[PDB]
Design a protein around this ligand. Structure first.
Ligand SMILES: COc1ccc(C[C@H](N)C(=O)O)cc1
Ligand SMILES: [Zn+2]
Length: 866
């Protein structure tokens, strides 16, 4: 498979302006008729090159003339000797039932549905399957009425009819030109939740949520969240919905989360269905965020689209920024910020050190579906947030407005977006643009000096980015570096210099620079990189007491949590070294006392307290280390939990009890209290065994919501408590028919600390609730093993690697997109010791040798083995 390069972009030789589709739908054989209106822009001698995959061509006509000047080639239909303007008619056949890759038109249970992003429309018909070709669609769907009573496409219904033999049809039209990746079709039998939203200006929009029969009891939160998204986008961004109907369809078989198809979003049912007995607080907030995200794409992705796929972050960084701002405004901003920074530092930084490292605007891609990444998404959003930090809200919104003014109805680039922000704000972003083209994580080193004679405080700040596997050359970035300086009473020292205030966002633009601040009347405790102001590693030689000071005094909740993380990081490192030497956990008394203080502080928001009391995950821990020792990290995480459980036992139990709530509500204050209570229960579970067993089994049985029941269950598994097997079996017996609920259980199984975990996981491939045909089940059993139990996955015997190879041998043929997500933990081999690295290399070499290796895996394996 040959790579494609960003620098190779050229405008298309032909455009399509209008496409009329007809589908004669049947799961074994669907016939597609596509009538396109095309215009040649290039040279008269250049052929029309259409993309297509696994299509059976029936006929090709040009202005109703059966055409002879064409040829099929790999991936393509090449049509020669065309007029400047013409009607193209293609008829072709496709097989939805055969589509196990879930790309194009496929089956989800008994429903037929589509996934077209990035390049799935070419699995439906021969087309210009590139996002700078925007066309007006009309879609006619013909099908069996009993099997497919609902026939859905983008837009509004324009025509409807009934035919003989029990067939009927519906035709849709969407007035807004779109790239084909935003085409959708759904056919099936559903329950339908119907509601309305009226826009600020008075447009009434019909809201329709399509769910499998018998799932309406699980649909109201998603509808609520849709309406909240619509309202928020009006309030915050000034953006209203632009069509008459908003349809969402929840499907059980879907490789990703959800898809922003215009007016007809298609969602993984995981990100729609919730009721208090089936879904946790986190599930509710994820549904909220994903419903928001897809809605927000209506402007940032649909009304303004991407010129080419290398501009994916244009829509995805910006839409993730918007989903984060939505969740943060409606809920806890500090909890959101903290979790997004957890993701950045613990997952995204690992990608940016890996063989798959790329800038947020990639330069080279083999399989575009491989570039829907933590980088493009989460680091993309940090890049947008940095523009917000440099511009401020008012100017950022001026930029958004200029962006839409300029680019509405078109496909644009990252550069276009940055230009709009520059022009609207008058802030120069020329240097800042390097964030789009340079990969890797910057390391920012800070030294300080306080001169009591002059009352000056000097920060010496340096930056460098290590070379990455993709780029041997690195240059300094424009790093917005926010600070705050605290005196001895915990008061903020005004920043100034030469008689003038100094903005607290320092512009760190050089490899090394100094910043001097005057009238600094007391040696400061600095808070550095406030609200994680740039996506960088910070190196500052913190004392423990500076960190516990910030935990008590810092004005922003984020900085209190970040200080806590720095305090723990020293001790995590210490204790992984100790584990390697066979020595027990060591923790200073003063460190435990800091966490005691957080537990007993009546002033602190319980939402913040819960996050300070949630230890970094094994993935966050691994980023502290050049070479990862995954057994040490897992065992130190457990031992640190057990140490704090012993040292804080009375305080944990008192806070656990104080935060008991007898009413369950999905409301942010209630969620906060519950997250704190359950953070205490986690430590209590690793305390004295009989008390732990009693507390956990009682919570499990007495819980009136899944949040609390799962928190107990998860604690029983993590602490290997006596009640574990009984509780695990009770859950299975109650919920085995409900795959989304069983996914939680599969995750618990795959992440168990138990010595025979892999044997249990392999046995669960035969479980009644497991199937290799369903991406969510795969993710929850196999993905969770490989990605979230790096201790068992990295068992010294190599057994974890071999297991994954067998699963990937299946999945390469069945569903390469899922396979490619699942290979990720093997491509991180260079972070492990030599013996592990040799085993992981041999696993990659076995996969490189598969017959019919997918492009998706080929790209990752070749980079990993370089
Ligand atoms: C291969 O199938 C998909 C690829 C991408 C997505 C993400 C969606 N655009 C979003 O950003 O939510 C969805 C599906
Ligand atoms: Zn998106």
């Amino acid at each position: 498979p040959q790579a494609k390069y960003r620098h190779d972009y050229r405008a298309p030789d032909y455009q399509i302006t209008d496409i009329d589709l007809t589908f004669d739908l049947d799961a074994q054989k669907t016939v597609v008729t596509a009538v396109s209106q095309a215009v040649r822009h290039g040279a008269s001698d250049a052929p029309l090159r259409l993309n297509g995959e696994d299509l059976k061509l029936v006929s090709v006509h040009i202005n109703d003339e059966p055409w002879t000047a064409w040829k099929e080639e790999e991936g393509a239909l090449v049509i020669s000797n065309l007029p400047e303007r013409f009607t193209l008619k293609i008829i072709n056949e496709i097989s939805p039932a055969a589509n196990t890759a879930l790309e194009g038109l496929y089956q989800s249970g008994d429903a037929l549905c589509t996934q077209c992003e990035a390049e799935g429309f070419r699995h439906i018909t021969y087309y210009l399957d590139r996002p700078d070709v925007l066309a007006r669609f009309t879609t006619k769907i013909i099908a069996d009425k009993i099997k497919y009573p609902f026939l859905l496409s983008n837009g509004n219904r324009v025509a409807q009819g009934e035919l003989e033999n029990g067939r009927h049809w519906v035709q849709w039209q969407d007035p807004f030109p779109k790239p084909c990746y935003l085409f959708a079709l759904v056919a099936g039998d559903f329950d339908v939740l119907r509601d309305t939203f009226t826009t600020r200006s008075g447009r009434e929009v019909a809201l329709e949520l399509y769910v499998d029969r018998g799932n309406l009891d699980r649909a109201p939160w998603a509808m609520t969240s849709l309406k909240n998204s619509m309202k928020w986008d009006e309030e915050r961004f000034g953006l209203e919905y632009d069509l008459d109907i908003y349809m969402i369809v929840a499907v059980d078989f879907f490789n990703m989360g959800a898809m922003e198809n215009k007016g007809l979003n298609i969602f993984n049912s995981k990100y729609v269905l919730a009721r208090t007995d089936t879904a946790t607080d986190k599930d509710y907030l994820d549904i909220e965020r994903v419903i928001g995200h897809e809605y927000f794409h209506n402007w940032t992705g649909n009304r303004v689209t991407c010129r080419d796929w290398f501009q994916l972050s244009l829509k995805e960084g910006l839409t993730v920024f918007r989903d984060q701002e939505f969740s943060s405004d409606l809920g806890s901003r500090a909890v959101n910020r903290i979790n997004n920074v957890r993701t950045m530092r613990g997952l995204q930084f690992a990608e940016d050190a890996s063989p798959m490292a790329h800038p947020i605007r990639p330069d080279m891609v083999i399989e575009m579906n491989n570039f829907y990444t933590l980088t493009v998404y989460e680091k993309g959003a940090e890049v947008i947030r940095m523009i917000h930090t440099l511009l401020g809200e008012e100017n950022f919104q001026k930029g958004m407005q200029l962006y839409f003014e300029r680019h509405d109805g078109s496909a644009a680039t990252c550069d276009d977006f940055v230009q709009a922000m520059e022009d609207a704000s008058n802030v120069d972003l020329s240097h800042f643009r390097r964030w789009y083209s340079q990969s890797g994580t910057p390391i920012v080193t800070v030294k300080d000096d306080y001169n009591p004679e002059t009352e000056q405080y000097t920060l010496t700040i340096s930056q460098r980015t290590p070379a990455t596997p993709d780029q041997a050359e690195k240059q300094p970035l424009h790093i917005p570096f926010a600070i705050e300086l605290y005196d001895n009473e915990g008061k903020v020292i005004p920043l100034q210099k030469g008689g003038h205030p100094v903005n607290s966002v320092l512009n760190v633009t050089q490899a090394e620079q100094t910043f001097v601040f005057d009238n600094v009347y007391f040696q400061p405790v600095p808070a550095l990189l406030c609200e994680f102001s740039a996506p960088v590693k910070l190196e500052y030689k913190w004392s423990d007491q500076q960190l516990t000071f910030l935990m008590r005094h810092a004005r922003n909740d984020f900085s209190r949590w970040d200080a806590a993380q720095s305090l723990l990081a020293t001790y995590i490192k210490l204790n992984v070294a100790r584990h390697q030497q066979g020595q027990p956990l060591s923790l200073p008394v003063h460190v435990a006392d800091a966490f005691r203080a957080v537990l007993l502080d009546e002033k602190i928001d319980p939402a913040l307290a819960a996050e300070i009391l949630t230890l970094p995950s094994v993935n966050e821990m691994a980023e502290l280390f050049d070479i990862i020792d995954p057994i040490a990290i897992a065992e130190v995480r457990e031992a640190l939990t057990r140490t704090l459980a012993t040292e804080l036992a009375d305080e944990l139990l008192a806070i656990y009890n104080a935060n008991y709530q007898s009413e369950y509500r999905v409301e942010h204050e209630d969620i906060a209290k519950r997250t704190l209570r359950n953070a205490c229960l986690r430590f209590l579970a690793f305390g004295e065994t009989h008390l732990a067993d009693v507390l956990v089994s009682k919570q499990f049985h007495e819980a009136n919501n899944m949040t609390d029941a799962l928190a107990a269950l998860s604690a029983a598994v993590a602490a290997q408590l006596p009640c574990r097997d009984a509780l695990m079996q009770e859950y299975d017996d109650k919920w085995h028919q409900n795959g989304l609920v069983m996914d939680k259980w599969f995750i618990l199984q795959a992440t168990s600390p138990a010595a025979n975990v892999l044997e249990t996981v392999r046995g669960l491939l035969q479980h009644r609730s497991f199937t290799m045909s369903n991406p969510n089940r795969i993710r929850s059993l196999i993905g969770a093993f490989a990605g979230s139990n790096p201790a068992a996955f990295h068992a010294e015997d190599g057994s974890g690697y071999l297991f994954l190879v067998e699963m990937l041998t299946d999945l390469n043929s069945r569903n390469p997109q899922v396979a490619s997500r699942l290979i990720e933990p093997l491509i991180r081999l260079k972070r492990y010791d030599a013996k592990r690295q040799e085993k992981m290399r041999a696993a990659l070499e076995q996969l490189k040798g598969l017959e019919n290796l997918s492009g998706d895996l080929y790209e990752k394996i070749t980079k990993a083995l370089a």
